[PDB]
Design a protein around this nucleic acid. Structure first.
Ligand SMILES: [Zn+2]
Ligand SMILES: [Zn+2]
Ligand SMILES: [Zn+2]
Ligand SMILES: [Zn+2]
Length: 1331
RNA sequence: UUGAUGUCACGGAACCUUUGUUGUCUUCGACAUGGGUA
């Protein structure tokens, strides 16, 4: 009587439940509840908080039971047992309580007489239906009833959308909660079956329960049985108290990238100087110390919790920065061939805009909804029949919907659990060539090689398997399965492997019984013993159809270095470099292997920009167009915001195993001629040379509609031909000569796109002459004094198109060396020495060659001198300071800065009472703490009268200061002898506090502390005879600790310029021609210099130790190379002393004396020192060749560029090291000039060089009427000495007392011809002697 | 913590849109310090 037996439900897939509702909101018309009727429900224990439990209703289990009962009733020949059944009751009285209505067609098994509601006996269908409260279905709450904090703690929200077949754009979306099946695997319940309706009813209920395949949205088997907040606050407080408050976003991104492993925290790089003073990590305790104490924590010894801690701290830092049925089964494995991206938005992570989909077990998940949608899309593609199936109403009667009704799949998850890698994407402005502001967004992807299981089942009134499904599976097995997102970026191309299939008839009694007992072979052991008997074959479709996407193979050759930027890998690196190469990881099992690649987004951007440049729509460029709601060619090919593109670009990977190389660069000041402070920057590009070219191979997928379109193929061929002919560079820093395209070859187009990819004058004679005398000595540099008028009235043109009336092409050049040339390779400073720095000549891939940055600097300097323009590099962060001589104004004082209205108190006078009865009055005075800076530095080998006690007074009773031995770092700390201390009331007057004398005093202590000359303390203003002040009106001027010492200026160096000679500010004032040609920080340059290669055997100054190899020279020892001293160029504090101009060196042959170990000035000897160089040089008469690529250059601009390269017959250039010793005199010869009339033809241009020179000279005389004296000054400075003419050029010596020649030294030149009031006129005249 | 004559929700791809790019010759000459007379 009412015997009850327990039941269990085990879920094999992640099931879903709907959002919880209150009893007032438990209605019929609510859309979310009527949608979630198919899923489980949630229950709240108490309404104050979210504590509750889930449960499943009994009506859903009832519906599954009658569905299975109908299936076995229509499968067992319509009849059951030995008595006639019924079709079933179908009647509803009240329409105001219908929660759900049956909109599905009832399966018809017979047209016999239905049994009535009241008869002698009841059929099994009647008692299962309920026509006989007899059968009760219980609830499925939980096994043992564990309590839970909330719904969010047991599952996760997810959003699913609906797409359109024609456009590919989603138009609607909904969301649902999903929980993991491994967290809640098991649900118990009770059921009351029958009392007196015999055994066939319970048997029918038994195989109806056994036939129940799915429930609650998933396939199931029914059986009858810390410190993150504290660390973030500490880091925030330390960054706030210390300086460098910026770069917090980069630090947070670096910390997020650090979550991969715990061992990288001990491998952070240091500063460029080698000390542990990194700008991003050694700021302070240090940030590195904080992360080190966080690393060696017993709590954070594991991996997943360390990852979660790093994610929380990174999020905190980002928030701070703000015969009938025939069941057919198919199984296989989906393998990734590209990195994929399944979208899943989480509100808890606001740092990355797009987030990949993961399980709470940190494993990658492939949902079944995407598989079902892609199957529907491929079916609609094969049949070419869009369907208008609405969400509700009558079921749709299309062929695709009938094929889909019967398709079941199985969710998959992998074993790879490493965190994803972040990818950044940036826009580029077309009118400028730089990245536009506010275009930063990151997004991560799963790596390639992740393998998923795959299962599929079919149930339909058909003998075998549909031909459309067979064709779709053949397409997937070919390797054209595109299911995940970002397809235009080239993401998510899977290939199905190990296809197995078998059909099972569902009308034979034995096979049906095998189905019921074996439970459909849907469990794990069921799959395990089904796979062995599963057939390994695969059928072939009859009406086969070709796929809609075609693969095109691309090969690119690069005879140049290449780099793709990555700031995050630069921040978390092993070495100190500003820029590194982009590197991506691929997964195989659990390990991830890194490879250098070229980003598909970069290639897509380059190709899109090329097509937009070469195609014009009614005069308006495609770059300038908004590309919104327009039918242009670029939107039709590459897609837009409202449609998907018909072309997909894949990632490109390099061949062989290249290794990165290190190149170092520095900026050169225009005036001083030395390297500007804090301007040394490094670079780590991939190596490339014409001898060993780089092979960039890859592919891209194109649609058949574009392939059959003749005009689209023609435009693509035009763009690919323009890319092939060296016009569009790939990568970054192309101005140095990086990433030039030599050759480009495509395959797989059937010769339909690739078929479109198929006398010099002489230099003018010079006219400037220089008189050279055979007994005079000249200064080894001069200034040109450029003109005070510059042009900024020209508006630059953009890079968005090729403007008419301008020239684009290449220039081949030559270079011959007249003096020895030194181009150093600074990677290794210990070549010759087995410490003294050594250096070596530059060599890329074991080939002697010259980088393009040095040549760019030479041509930029000469072009900047010829065309009047700003100083492109100037150290405006320096203040001058000169020493005054003995000569009345600086009155002594002893006062702080508190207030006003003071008197003439305190005592100060010279002392070394017993001499006079009234004198040496000592009442006020305490222990003195003073700055020890009152002894000379005569050298020529403790403070409080211990180490020194001698005087000079011996015979003449005068001058008692004795010449002491200052060579042990002594007698500066030991000071204050004959102190001007006290004993006369004649000092200490008024003082007020300015904002100018104070910073001048701290800069005076900066000069005193950082003195690199007298080293063989205090940074505050204190008393102790340190208030020697002069005053004007009420305020005061600068103060000094010693009555005769160094004084500092108050005018900065940048105010020594002209009104318009200051560097260009931009941010629109206008641009100078040099900034207009070579570019600024917010403007791309229009020239591209290339690397210069050698032709023949290099001749060296000294042969090497091994005569077999002619590629190695011999060492030569250079002399002392010390810093420039602007204090001689600008003599004093006067307003009339300004800057002379830009510095140029002179041509001479002093290296002949330097070869045989002689100084240029003394001629005695050269000794080993820790402060010189021992390099090797290329001899005179060496040929180099290079190429300059230009775009949209004007005629006069090209003429002046040609003039700046060629010069005249008698001039030369300066290159390399030791320009003061006459090293590196080169001349540039123009060999060939090519132009670009059209994309298909490239013409001559060896002619029209005199025409361009004439237009350039016309522009020069347009700018300046007759004041072209700097041109003759340039020609005089660049004039090369002729034969039988060897002038002597050397720097003056420190003193005359050691000169065999007897020439005047610096101290004699100070009073004489190089007087203070005429030094700026005697230095601004080329070849002016001083001897 | 479902209520007994009617549940195709395995009826719905988080899909499409965006070059980490621009600018810089691994270069080179004049000093450092305070007294000492009337
Ligand atoms: Zn019946
Ligand atoms: Zn349809
Ligand atoms: Zn458009
Ligand atoms: Zn400028």
């Amino acid at each position: 009587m009412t015997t009850t037996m327990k039941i269990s439900i085990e879920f094999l897939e992640p099931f879903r439940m709907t959002k919880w509702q209150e009893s007032t909101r438990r209605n019929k018309n609510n859309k979310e509840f009527v949608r979630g009727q198919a899923f489980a429900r949630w229950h709240r224990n108490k309404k104050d908080n979210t504590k509750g439990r889930p449960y499943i209703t009994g009506t859903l289990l009832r519906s599954a039971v009658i569905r299975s009962a109908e299936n076995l009733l229509t499968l067992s020949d319509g009849k059951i047992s030995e008595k006639t059944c019924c079709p079933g009751k179908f009647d509803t009285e009240d329409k105001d309580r219908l929660l759900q209505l049956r909109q599905r067609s009832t399966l018809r098994w017979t047209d016999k007489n239905p049994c009535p509601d009241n008869a002698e006996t009841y059929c099994p269908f009647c008692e299962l239906l309920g026509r006989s409260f007899r059968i009760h279905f219980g609830n499925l709450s939980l096994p043992g009833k564990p309590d839970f904090d909330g719904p969010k703690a047991i599952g996760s929200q997810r959003v699913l959308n609906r797409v359109d077949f024609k456009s590919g754009k989603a138009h609607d979306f909904f969301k649902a909660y999903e929980v993991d099946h491994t967290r809640f695997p098991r649900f118990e319940g009770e059921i009351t079956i029958d009392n007196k309706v015999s055994a066939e009813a319970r048997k029918l209920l038994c195989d109806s329960l056994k036939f129940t395949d799915r429930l609650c949205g998933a396939l199931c088997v029914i059986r009858f049985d810390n410190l993150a907040e504290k660390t973030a606050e500490q880091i925030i407080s330390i960054l706030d108290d210390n300086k460098k408050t910026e770069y917090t976003r980069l630090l947070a991104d670096a910390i997020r990238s650090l979550r991969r492993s715990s061992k990288l925290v001990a491998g952070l790089p240091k500063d460029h100087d080698g000390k542990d003073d990194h700008y991003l990590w050694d700021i302070g305790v240090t940030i590195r110390q904080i992360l080190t104490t966080s690393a060696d924590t017993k709590e954070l010894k594991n991996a997943g919790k360390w990852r979660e801690f790093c994610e929380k701290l990174g999020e905190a830092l980002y928030l701070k920065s703000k015969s009938v049925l025939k069941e057919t089964v198919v199984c296989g494995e989906l393998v990734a061939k590209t990195p994929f991206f399944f979208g899943a938005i989480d509100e808890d992570a606001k740092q990355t805009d797009l987030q990949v989909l993961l399980t709470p077990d940190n494993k990658y998940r492939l949902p079944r909804s995407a598989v079902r949608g892609i199957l529907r899309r491929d079916l609609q593609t094969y049949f070419d029949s869009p369907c208008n199936a609405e969400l509700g109403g009558r079921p749709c009667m299309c062929k695709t919907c009938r094929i889909m009704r019967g398709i079941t799949v199985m969710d998959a998850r992998s074993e790879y659990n490493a965190p994803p890698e972040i990818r950044h994407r940036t826009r580029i402005n077309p009118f400028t060539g730089t990245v536009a502001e506010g275009a930063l967004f990151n997004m991560e992807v799963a790596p390639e090689g992740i393998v998923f299981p795959f299962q599929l089942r079919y149930r339909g009134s058909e003998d075998g398997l549909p031909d459309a499904l067979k064709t779709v599976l053949k397409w997937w097995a070919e390797g054209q399965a595109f299911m995940s997102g970002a397809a235009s970026t080239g993401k998510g191309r899977f290939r199905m492997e190990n296809a197995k299939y078998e059909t099972l008839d569902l009308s034979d009694e034995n096979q049906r019984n095998d189905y019921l007992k074996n439970w459909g072979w849907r469990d794990e052991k069921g799959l395990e013993e089904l796979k062995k008997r599963l057939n390994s074959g695969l059928p072939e479709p009859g009406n086969y159809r070709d796929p809609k996407w075609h693969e095109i193979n691309v090969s690119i050759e690069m005879a140049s270095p290449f780099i793709n930027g990555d700031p995050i890998r630069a921040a978390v690196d092993k070495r100190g470099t500003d820029v590194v190469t982009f590197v991506k990881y691929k997964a195989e099992g659990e390990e991830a292997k890194p490879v250098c690649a070229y980003k598909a987004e970069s290639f897509r951007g380059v190709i899109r920009s090329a097509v937009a440049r070469i195609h014009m729509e009614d005069g308006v460029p495609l770059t300038e167009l908004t590309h919104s709601d327009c039918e242009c060619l670029l939107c039709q090919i590459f897609g837009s915001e409202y449609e998907a593109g018909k072309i997909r670009f894949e990632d490109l990977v390099f061949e062989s195993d290249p290794e990165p190389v290190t190149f170092d660069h520095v900026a050169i000041d225009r005036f001083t001629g030395g390297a500007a402070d804090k301007k040394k920057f490094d670079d780590s590009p991939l190596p490339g040379s014409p001898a060993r070219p780089l092979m960039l191979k890859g592919s891209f997928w194109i649609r058949r509609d574009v392939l059959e379109d003749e005009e689209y193929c023609k435009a693509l061929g035009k763009a690919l031909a323009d890319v092939n002919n060296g016009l569009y560079p790939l990568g970054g820093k192309s101005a140095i000569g990086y990433g030039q395209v030599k050759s480009l070859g495509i395959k797989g187009d059937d010769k339909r796109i690739s078929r479109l990819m198929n006398a010099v004058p002489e230099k003018p004679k010079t006219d400037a002459e220089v008189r050279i005398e055979a007994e005079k000595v000249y200064y080894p540099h001069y200034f040109v004094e450029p003109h005070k008028k510059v042009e900024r009235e020209e508006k630059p043109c953009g890079h968005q198109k090729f403007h008419e009336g301008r020239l684009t092409g290449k220039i081949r050049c030559k270079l011959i060396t007249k003096t020895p040339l030194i181009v150093p390779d600074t990677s290794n400073d210990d070549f010759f020495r087995p410490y003294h720095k050594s250096y070596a000549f530059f060599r890329l891939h074991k080939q002697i060659m010259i980088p393009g940055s040095e040549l760019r600097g030479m041509v930029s300097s000469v072009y900047e001198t010829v065309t009047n323009s700003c100083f492109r590099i100037f150290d405006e962060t320096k203040r001058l300071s000169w020493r005054m001589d003995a000569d009345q104004d600086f009155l002594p004082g002893r006062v702080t800065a508190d207030g006003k209205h003071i008197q003439k108190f305190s005592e100060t006078a010279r002392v070394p009472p017993e001499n006079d009865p009234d004198g040496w009055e000592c009442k006020e005075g305490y222990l003195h703490v003073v700055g020890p800076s009152k002894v000379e530095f005569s050298d020529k080998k403790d403070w409080k009268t211990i180490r020194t006690n001698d005087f000079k007074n011996r015979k003449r009773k005068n001058e008692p200061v004795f010449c002491c031995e200052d060579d042990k770092g002594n007698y500066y700390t030991m000071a204050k002898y004959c102190e001007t201390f006290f004993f006369d009331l004649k000092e200490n007057e008024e003082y007020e506090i300015p904002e100018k004398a104070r910073i001048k005093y701290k800069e005076l202590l900066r000069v005193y502390n950082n003195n690199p000359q007298a080293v063989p303390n205090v940074e505050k203003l204190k008393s102790g005879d340190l208030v020697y002040f002069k005053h004007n009106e009420k305020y005061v001027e600068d103060i000094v600790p010693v009555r005769i010492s160094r004084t500092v200026d108050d005018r900065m160096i940048g105010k020594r310029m002209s009104a318009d000679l200051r560097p260009c500010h931009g941010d629109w004032k206008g641009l100078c021609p040099a900034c207009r040609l070579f570019g600024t920080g917010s403007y791309k340059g229009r020239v591209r210099f290339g690397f210069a290669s050698l032709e023949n055997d290099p001749e060296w100054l000294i042969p090497g130790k091994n005569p077999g190899d002619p590629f190695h020279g011999g060492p030569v020892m250079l002399s002392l190379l010390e810093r420039p001293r602007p204090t001689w160029s600008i003599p004093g504090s006067d307003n009339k002393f300004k800057v002379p101009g830009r510095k140029f060196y002179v041509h001479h042959h002093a290296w002949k004396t330097i070869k045989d170990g002689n100084h240029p000035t003394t001629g005695k000897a050269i000794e080993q020192s820790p402060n010189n160089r021992t390099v090797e040089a290329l001899a005179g008469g060496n040929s180099f060749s290079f190429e300059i690529a230009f775009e949209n250059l004007k005629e006069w601009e090209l003429g002046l560029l040609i003039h700046s390269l060629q010069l005249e017959k008698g001039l030369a250039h300066k290159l390399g090291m030791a320009k003061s010793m006459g090293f590196g005199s080169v001349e540039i010869d123009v060999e060939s000039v090519r132009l670009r009339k059209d994309w298909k033809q490239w013409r001559n241009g060896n002619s029209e060089i005199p025409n361009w020179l004439g237009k350039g000279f016309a522009k020069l005389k347009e700018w300046f009427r007759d004041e072209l004296d700097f041109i003759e000054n340039l020609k005089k400075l660049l004039w090369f000495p002729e034969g039988d003419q060897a002038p002597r050029v050397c720097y003056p010596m420190l003193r005359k007392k050691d000169d065999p020649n007897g020439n005047s030294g610096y101290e004699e030149l100070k009073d004489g011809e190089f007087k203070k009031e005429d030094r700026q006129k005697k230095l601004t005249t080329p070849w002016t002697p001083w001897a």
